Amino acid sequence: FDMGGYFIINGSEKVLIAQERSAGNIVQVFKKAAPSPISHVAEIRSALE
Amino acid sequence: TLSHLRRTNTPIAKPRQLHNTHWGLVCPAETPEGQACGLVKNL
Amino acid sequence: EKAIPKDQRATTPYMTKYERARILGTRALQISMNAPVFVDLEGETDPLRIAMKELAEKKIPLVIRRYLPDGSFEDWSVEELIVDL
Amino acid sequence: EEGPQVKIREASKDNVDFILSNVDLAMANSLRRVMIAEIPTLAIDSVEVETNTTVLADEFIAHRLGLIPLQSMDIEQLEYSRDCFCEDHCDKCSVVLTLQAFGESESTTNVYSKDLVIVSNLMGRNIGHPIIQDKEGNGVLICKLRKGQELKLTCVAKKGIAKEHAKWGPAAAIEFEYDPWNKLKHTDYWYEQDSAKEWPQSKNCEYEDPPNEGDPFDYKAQADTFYMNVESVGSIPVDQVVVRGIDTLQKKVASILLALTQM
Amino acid sequence: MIVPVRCFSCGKVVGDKWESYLNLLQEDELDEGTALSRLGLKRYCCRRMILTHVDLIEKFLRYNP
Amino acid sequence: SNTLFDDIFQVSEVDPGRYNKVCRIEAASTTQDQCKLTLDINVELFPVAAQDSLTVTIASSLTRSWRPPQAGDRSLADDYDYVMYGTAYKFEEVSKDLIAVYYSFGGLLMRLEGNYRNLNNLKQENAYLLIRR
Amino acid sequence: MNAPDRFELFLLGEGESKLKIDPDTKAPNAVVITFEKEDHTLGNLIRAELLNDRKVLFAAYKVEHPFFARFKLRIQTTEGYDPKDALKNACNSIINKLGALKTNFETEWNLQTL
Amino acid sequence: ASRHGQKGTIGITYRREDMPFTAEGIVPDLIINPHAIPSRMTVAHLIECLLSKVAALSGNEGDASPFTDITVEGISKLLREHGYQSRGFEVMYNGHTGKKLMAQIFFGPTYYQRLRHMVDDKIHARARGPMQVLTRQPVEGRSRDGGLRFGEMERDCMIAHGAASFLKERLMEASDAFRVHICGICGLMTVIAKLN
Amino acid sequence: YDRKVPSPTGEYVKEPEWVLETDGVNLSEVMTVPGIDPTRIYTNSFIDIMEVLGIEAGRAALYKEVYNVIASDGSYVNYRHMALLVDVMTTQGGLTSVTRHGFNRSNTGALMRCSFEETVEILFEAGASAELDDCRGVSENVILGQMAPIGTGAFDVMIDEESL
Amino acid sequence: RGNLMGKRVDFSARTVISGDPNLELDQVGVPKSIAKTLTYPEVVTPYNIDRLTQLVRNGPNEHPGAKYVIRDSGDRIDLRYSKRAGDIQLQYGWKVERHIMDNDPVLFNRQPSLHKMSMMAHRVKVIPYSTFRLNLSVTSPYNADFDGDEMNLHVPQSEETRAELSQLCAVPLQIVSPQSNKPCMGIVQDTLCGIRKLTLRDTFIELDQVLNMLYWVPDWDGVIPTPAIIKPKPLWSGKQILSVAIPNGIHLQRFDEGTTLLSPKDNGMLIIDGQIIFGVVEKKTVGSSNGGLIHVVTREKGPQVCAKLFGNIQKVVNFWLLHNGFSTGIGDTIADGPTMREITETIAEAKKKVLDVTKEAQANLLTAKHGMTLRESFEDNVVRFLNEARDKAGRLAEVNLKDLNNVKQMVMAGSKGSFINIAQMSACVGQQSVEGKRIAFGFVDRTLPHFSKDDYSPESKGFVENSYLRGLTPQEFFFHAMGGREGLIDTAVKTAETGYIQRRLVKALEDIMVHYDNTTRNSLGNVIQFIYGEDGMDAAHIEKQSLDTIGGSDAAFEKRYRVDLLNTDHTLDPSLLESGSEILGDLKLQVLLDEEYKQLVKDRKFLREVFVDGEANWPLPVNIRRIIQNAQQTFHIDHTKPSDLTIKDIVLGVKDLQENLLVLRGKNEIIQNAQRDAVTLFCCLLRSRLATRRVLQEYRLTKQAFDWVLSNIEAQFLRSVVHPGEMVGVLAAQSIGEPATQMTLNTFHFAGVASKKVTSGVPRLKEILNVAKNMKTPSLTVY
Amino acid sequence: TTFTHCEIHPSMILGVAASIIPFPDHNQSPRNTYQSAMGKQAMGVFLTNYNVRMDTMANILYYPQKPLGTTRAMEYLKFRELPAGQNAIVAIACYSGY
RNA sequence: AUCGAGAGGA
Ligand SMILES: O=c1ccn([C@@H]2O[C@H](COP(=O)(O)OP(=O)(O)OP(=O)(O)O)[C@@H](O)[C@H]2O)c(=O)[nH]1
């Protein structure tokens, strides 16, 4: 009934817990607040997979 | 065991909410209360 | 000096809750160390409970120093305070 | 004869169904109860494990054994070990049992309470026969054994009463009803819709007169005539339960009446 | 985990019965309830001794040692 | 002492307002016109059907304990069917000589109104209510 | 590990004896009997039978904490009747009902078949 | 724990004999509270139990699954052909007397979960045990024979009360307490107490 | 709006009134307008009721807000308390927030004020100014292990005669 | 912070808590293995020597016993080992560290501890089973249940520490908390629901029980009270036997809605001493309400007495309900068929009335609304309609009960649950609230993929149509799920936020305490307010009181206070006074009756300006109303016998008392004014109540009498002062900082109105206390 | 009326532990979360080999039991063979007080 | 025995 999906590090069962992140290479637009100079800003996290 | 295997961690505008697009991907009710709530997710 | 005279004391003749909680407590600390008792013991043998009977019959020898804010103070005896409360 | 009355309906080796007439509620219930708790019996208490290479861990095995039933027929002639004068236990107060299964087959090698052995001297009395009601002969599946599995333990069974543990209870479940129309209005019947249709009647409606709506509520009425059914686990044949029941209930009213003369 | 003796809530020795329940529908192709009704269990507290009961002793015995 | 009130009343309203063992009753006297009475009856013990004359009395006796009756040789003013014990409270005056006393018998209330309750119903934490036929 | 040994439900401890009668501080001709190691099985019985006795003014019982078998019952009777006697006569009757319901059961049993 | 977030701790063990009972002789394992219910608005808890009894009676599998054609209605109908007031309840008798129960009481089988926690593995006391080296205050960890913090919160509550010698006691005579030497001029701890 | 107010006949009578409500603030401007009541105009900003009408008003508009949070939630707290909060916030001349900006920079103790926020840098410039310490506040005597002058410790006991 | 303001401590314990409906209020069940390891440094006295020498032999294992024996010579005698453990020669002047014992003072604590209440002195009853047990009505102010909650307890080590424990922190005293000028402990759960049952008019119980019940109350005087019914079968009324717990001279009068001294509804409440007269007992009385039993018993009789009372109610009700049962079953939400169609056809009429609105704005005929978006009004417009629906269709399930409906009975007692809990399930769920607006177009222009874009009807944007009983449709589930998350999210945030505001509020008044001149000072010794809370009165000795002088007509006023002896119509008929016909006419004393009235009209003009609004009820010290009922009993008064006073008695006497009501003592002049000023309000009441045409017309005092009431009002006033020493800073903060934590919605339900978003919840309190420059919802509200 | 796809079956938005709650569509939605808080803390039979492994801490239930009422989905999570609870007969009634 | 992170209880 063990399904696995973990590692063994010195008699100990270690699981890798999936990590979230914002996706890259998607171009998004963002309104920027009232007390600052810039009205709109567009961002892209360019990185090679 | 069978949960702690299918888990989902988020670092750190409305991140803790159960955003619409969650449909069928993240469970809408399986989450840890207080502390880091809604930030940790299950499949 | 400093000390404000008996005549012209302007505080509460009524004993404060705190005052008595300390009066009973300090006499209890003595009584516990079997130092002389000042009343007929009606079968009672609990330090704290004795102090109540002594404060009942006003036979406790301790004067209270009350400090007003400027630095001066007022003196009342547990012999002259009202223990109504 | 005289006071409180009985009228049996069914009387199996395991079930006594009866009515009970002209008694107080206070006394019926207090007989229903003394039945559950307070009736001497015999069961395993001191399990002394020598070898156990089982899938089952030691004190499990040795908790089933307690629950397992043992013939408590002549139990009234065997001292409580708390009462005895012997060191830990003798043939006058305790009966000693030995299990002993090795595994053997390639197949699973089951262990039943049929497999137990009596070792203690019985002096000659009806005590310590693991109760077997199962058709094929082997009541109560203790534990399984694969191949080289061994199990060998020694048992001591002491007299006791279900007020201590429920291993000593000879009772099982006790059915008990009184007044099936509610002419005592002891309750008040819930309904979203209707009392008469929403709740079914008891199998006991048969025996008692219905109400007749045209009559005022019977006020000076009293708790009377109770519908008991008694089961038996098997250490005592149903009747003796409900005899010793009445008997103990009496016997410890005695110790009071007595205690009054002493002090 | 090896069928109970007595049921918890009443204490009808539901001990010797497990093996039988395994026969009355394996062999005597019955449906559940009717197999309980025949075994002796009117009262569902005992009746739920054996309808829920899961028998793992079956697996632990499979480990070789 | 002795008695304090005596009359015959005509029941004009039985009211099962959200109860099952108690009913509020409504009645006026056959004998005299200007009077009215309200009373919480234990309908389950003495059933009351509308337009159903009753006789209503008040005493102050027939103080230590209430002992179980044991009427092997006892005596109360028990000639009647239905009897309660209670306490009088407000002594209200509806303008001019009209007057009304309020009684509580363990929560069951009684509002009696008339005029010739005169030299009779002093606040005596006594008062037994009695009903027959 | 804070668990009161089982056999402390029916065995009498040490010092502790089965009956303890004390004058009722409050009511004339009254008494409070303390029953060590005994409870509902036997408390209710003696109360609801004792109420049948017509020369009995007052009678009631209560287990005070469910943690202990020890139950109390207090009994008031009529001028010239001893509380203790009233118990004796009550207990006795209960003997008699149960020594009866025994033999009345005895014969109904024998006469049944299967 | 139920399966819905009714929690609870056993406030008392009761024997069968003292416990309420249904005319058939059954007796609960398990006696929560009415009030458990309107507050938390778990209804499933109520369903799951209904249709669960039905599942002990029938020999059928219960089906709890989410979006289906199960209703209270569809179920009840399936109980009052097995013979129990078709919305659960059951008529019971108080155990102490034997009297009937003046109100009938939803009763029926269900899951319960045995969570960790409890009790002889958090129960703890201390009257001076071991202390730290860095502060001469008592050590943290139940196990390690610790001592429970009197957090700044607590202090606050102590002051409200005005009970001040006890606030000092909590803070000197247990925990720390120490005697140093000062020079009445310079005002520090240079003093070398060549004692005795 | 509802408003209860005396009819000539002595009793209070329910009387309606038209009330204008706004999004934004500039008080010293609206109140000078014709046709309005410059005696009962009100803006939820207690920081401008202060600027325009003066510290004493400030006190009670602040109160009104502290209040129209508890009672509006349906909870009740006795004046004295919110008064004392409102008061402490007010005595020091203007408004004095309950943060390490307002009250805590105030000239209290040193120990007693480091038991809050920015703990070290307070102790530092407490040794640059060589600022003295009263040791009369609470926390001071908490840190030193003394019986602090509170309820119990508010007064001194002794030691009289008497004995004759 | 970690090590000086908050130290790890000795002589303590912590376990799990349980209910014990058989323990008494001020007690705590401390399991053996604990009070087997805690010790109290007790000295050797000729008093306790005997009960000590036997603790040594016994030692650390048997319970009542000891651990260490402490001598003079520093040395510790360790008697869990030791050669000399089984003997000892004890002199006076040593110490015997005995085990903790039955009936000792201890401090019971439960964190978050944010409350002069989270901290209480209790008595110790040593018990088996390893839990702390505590009695059921000390549950509100510790704020616990027993769901695995656990708790803290330290044991004093010094003879006064333990005095200062029981004489200040003792639960009994702490019954009436200075937060809310009302008690903070009441009857709840079973006991509450039950008392409502036991107290219905329908509810009678007969001999058998009415004997045990009486025996169940420990301070019962052994008198079976005479039954309500004595006709066939002598029934005792519920009410009747409960009135056995209620002590003597306890007077209470209420009135709920339509209540008429005859209680058709059986509502309201009246206790005429000891016994109750009518009404139904629940939360509004036997609960920690403003002016119910608990509040009244405590001031009237005392703490120790009220703290006994608490137990006595429960012993009974609990016992009664023990043997009467009650329960709740799914069917308790099965609402009636012919109404079911009714409910669903009421949403159906709300559903099609959003249509015509949607069809309107889509046809461009909707305007404006004023000061909003075209869109933004429609959004408001729909939440109203859809809450209107939910709440109407809710109260169609609230009427469809069903008195033998278990649920309603609870809400009808006030033991648990509310109307919304009944609308939810049985009827329908409602609109799903997120970020103040209804469910947001997560996916572009539609909330889920199973909808079409641009869909603005109820369930496209998160209306759950069904109840809980029918079950939530997939689409809905996720929606409910969403709003659900937000609920949890901003708990683990509102808690976090509050518990900063508390702390800031705390470290900021920390030390403001009342001094020995009744002024209020800090560390520096600055005055903050010159008489604590503008009157010098400890909040705990306070009750709301009607004023009356404010309301009613001037006509109504001149027929209440005008004693015109000169006017042959407005005199006190010889009916009222022993004087009367000798006082009519006269001028010598009319000039006193005159200047009484004039002072009373100036009251009426004064109050009308202080309380602009009319509202005539205000918290004030000494309940006068209740001192009259006391006089109307303690002196057995016949409303037919005509006083014995002079006018001079009344009018002169009341002025003298007026000057005797001291608050500030100073012999100067400015002080003697603040004397007047902090006494001023109270007096307007006092003037209003002890006025001539009242003291003779309404409540009909004698001389004898009166003087009693006069001395009482004085004696009760003086006891209501703030006790200099009273640490008021901590008390302020704590008391505003706790509601904070038990607030809901940092949004609100003003959010039907998408513009009456006036910033509250915590956020407001955060903006106020931060003294924010940029506040969120600023507003002129011109008149 | 312009579909392209259809959902496999709507109980598949649930995660591994909610698919144990019987009747999630009849709970208020927070309490559905709490059962997934717990139930993880709720002991049963962590694996079958449990008597062959050496782990700090191990809890095994004397008598575990497939619930009397399952989720269709339970079956792929193998609950019915490795269950974490017992079938108690529960009495929703106010009693002695405790 | 200390510093670091997480898991969980209210
Ligand atoms: O004072 C209270 C306390 C508790 N409650 C009820 O319980 C909660 C309030 O307090 P909790 O938040 O502690 O209850 P909970 O159900 O959320 O968590 P548990 O303690 O059961 O683990 C609320 O959900 C409410 O239903 C109150 O209604 N009022």
Ligand SMILES: [Mg+2]
């Ligand atoms: Mg709670």
Ligand SMILES: [Mg+2]
């Ligand atoms: Mg809790």
Ligand SMILES: [Zn+2]
């Ligand atoms: Zn022997």
Ligand SMILES: [Zn+2]
């Ligand atoms: Zn069973």
